From a paper:
Variable-heavy-heavy domains (VHHs) or nanobodies are single-domain heavy-chain only fragments found in members of the camelidae family (camels, llamas, alpacas, etc.). To explore antibody applications beyond traditional heavy-light chain mAbs, we identified and biophysically characterized a novel single-domain antibody specific for fentanyl from a camelid variable-heavy-heavy (VHH) domain phage display library. Our lead VHH (JGFN4) was specific for fentanyl and displayed no cross-reactivity with the closely related synthetic opioid carfentanil. The recognition of the fentanyl by JGFN4 was driven by hydrophobic interactions between the bottom of the binding pocket with the N-phenylpropanimide moiety and hydrogen bonding with a tertiary amine in the piperidine ring.
We next decided to investigate the structure and detailed interactions of the N76D mutation. As observed for JGFN4 WT, we obtained monomeric and dimeric forms of JGFN4 N76D when it was expressed in E. coli. Both species yielded crystals in the presence of fentanyl, and the structures were determined at 1.60 and 1.85-Å resolution. As expected, crystals obtained with the dimeric form showed a domain-swapped dimer with the trans conformation of CDR3 and fentanyl bound to each protomer. A comparison of the electrostatic surface potential for JGFN4 WT and JGFN4 N76D bound to fentanyl showed that the binding pocket of JGFN4 WT was narrower and less negatively charged compared to the strong negative charge in JGFN4 N76D. It was found that the substituted D76 side chain forms a hydrogen bond not only with the tertiary amine nitrogen of the piperidine moiety but also with the side chain of T28 from CDR1. While a structural comparison between the fentanyl-bound JGFN4 WT dimer and fentanyl-free JGFN4 WT monomer was instructive, having the monomeric and dimeric JGFN4 N76D structures both in complex with fentanyl allows for a more direct comparison to understand how the JGFN4 dimerization benefits fentanyl binding. A superposition of the two structures shows that the N-phenylpropanamide moiety of fentanyl is more tightly surrounded by protein residues in the dimer. N32 is positioned closer to fentanyl due to its interaction with L100 in the extended trans conformation (e.g., N32 Cα to the carbonyl oxygen atom of fentanyl is 1.2 Å closer) in the dimer. We reason that the flexibility of glycine residues in the unique CDR3 sequence of JGFN4 (98GVLG101) promotes switching to the trans conformation, which helps to shape a tighter binding pocket for fentanyl through its interaction with CDR1 residues including N32. JGFN4 N76D was able to still form a domain-swapped dimer and we were able to crystalize it in both monomeric and dimeric forms in complex with fentanyl.
Residue numbers in the entry:
A (entry chain B), B (entry chain A): 1 to 113
Amino acid sequence: QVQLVESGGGLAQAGGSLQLSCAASGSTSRVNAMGWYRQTPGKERELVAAIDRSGATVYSESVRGRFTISKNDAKDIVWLQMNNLTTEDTAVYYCRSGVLGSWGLGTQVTVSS
Amino acid sequence: QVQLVESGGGLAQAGGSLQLSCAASGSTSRVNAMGWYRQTPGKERELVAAIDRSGATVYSESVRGRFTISKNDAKDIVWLQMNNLTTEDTAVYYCRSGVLGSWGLGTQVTVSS
Ligand SMILES: CCC(=O)N(c1ccccc1)C1CCN(CCc2ccccc2)CC1
Ligand SMILES: CCC(=O)N(c1ccccc1)C1CCN(CCc2ccccc2)CC1
């Protein structure tokens, strides 16, 4: 029962920058990953950037180097800094929560020489 | 109550390839994301690749083009095809399940000119 509210959208000029926010409320203590997605006109919704509780980030090829995902843990807010915008960035941007669960026992990989 | 068992690790020479598998059992119907992590000696466990129930994948920069994550939904098994191994890939590799939640209403971004 986690609630997500995205803000910061609007009209932006090409090459400019925007900052999107996603405010999470409800039972957020279990949420240890957050993701930003976008649905560009005519296309499928796609992951753009994600961040987990350790602070690790990962980005899609289409935004890598341009977008930055960050978080304010004290207020349960995730931010998507979008730079160097083009018309190809026009989309509805969506925030999503994740509860990452248990791990396996693992398997050793050793690479020689 | 989800159990994960990784297999397929071993000794490989540089430039070789490995195929890891992760068998999930238990109450898996809610699990709609799976990730592979690695923990090299002395460092934090780190995301290598993840896949969700719609087939979307994301990879860390260090493995993109070398590793492929895939899934057999019929058997609740995920695979990590590891190609072009280097000595820096030596680690314990872990599988991990995740439940990604609902979406917000989203926020529209329109980029002009
Ligand atoms: C990568 C995400 C992550 O791990 N989080 C997160 C989630 C959404 C948006 C921004 C960040 C945490 C979720 C839990 N909040 C704690 C809230 C709290 C405070 C006091 C008592 C009980 C609960 C810390 C941040
Ligand atoms: C991307 C992850 C994902 O969506 N899952 C998944 C989880 C782990 C590993 C591979 C996939 C689904 C979990 C539920 N199973 C469904 C039903 C079932 C039950 C028992 C045996 C076989 C099938 C479909 C796949």
